[PDB]
Amino acid sequence: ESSFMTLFPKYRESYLKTIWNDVTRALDKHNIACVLDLVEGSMTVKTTRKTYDPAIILKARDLIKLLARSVPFPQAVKILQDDMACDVIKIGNFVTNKERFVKRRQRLVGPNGNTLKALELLTKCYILVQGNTVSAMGPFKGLKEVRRVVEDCMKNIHPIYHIKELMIKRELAKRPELANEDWSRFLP
Amino acid sequence: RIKKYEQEAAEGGIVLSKVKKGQFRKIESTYKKDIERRIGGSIKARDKE
């Protein structure tokens, strides 16, 4: 008999109260019980005596983590989906210069959100740049490329380079001629 | 809605695209409803004044 708990601050308290019938519907559909506490700001999920997927309870743990980290409900359920995962990526501990750090992550998110929407769409992922952390949910490959790209952008390679690299790799994979080559003569 | 969104992200800090001082922040809601054909970029009377 297993369970997990995680904590939310007050604004997410508001939206969580708003959505709670939905998360209980979904965890009902998978036969997992969940409880919301407004006094301790707490959120618990627990296994039943009729459930048969402790993998799904692990999923639900990561679910509630995402909800408290404030991605909305449709993305919550898309993480409860089978072949998906979310990932916390630390980017606080790279640049000593405060303004340089702030500037570099601003470059990551890109003007008018252009860079963010572009990389998200290419990777089928969903990305939330949270202060000194980055959260990424999606299919496993998508997370892999996202982690590499965000790390280089915290480093000193422009995501503009990375988006072009992803696009070229995308076309190369799309055309099924070269299934065993280096491709380095293609990539920039 | 834009005030709600800025307050949302700012208050749970999610770094955003730096909008100018004048215009309206651009979001998926305005991309999808195609509102600026009817409202505009920003209030040009205030911009000229």
Partner: peptide
């Protein structure tokens, strides 16, 4: 910066995303 298809994909990224309901060629 002086590339032409990439910049175009960026500036159209939002449109494609909110009108898919991937294609950018």
């Amino acid at each position: 910066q002086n590339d032409l298809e990439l910049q175009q994909f960026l500036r159209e990224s939002h449109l494609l995303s909110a009108f898919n309901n991937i294609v950018y060629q």
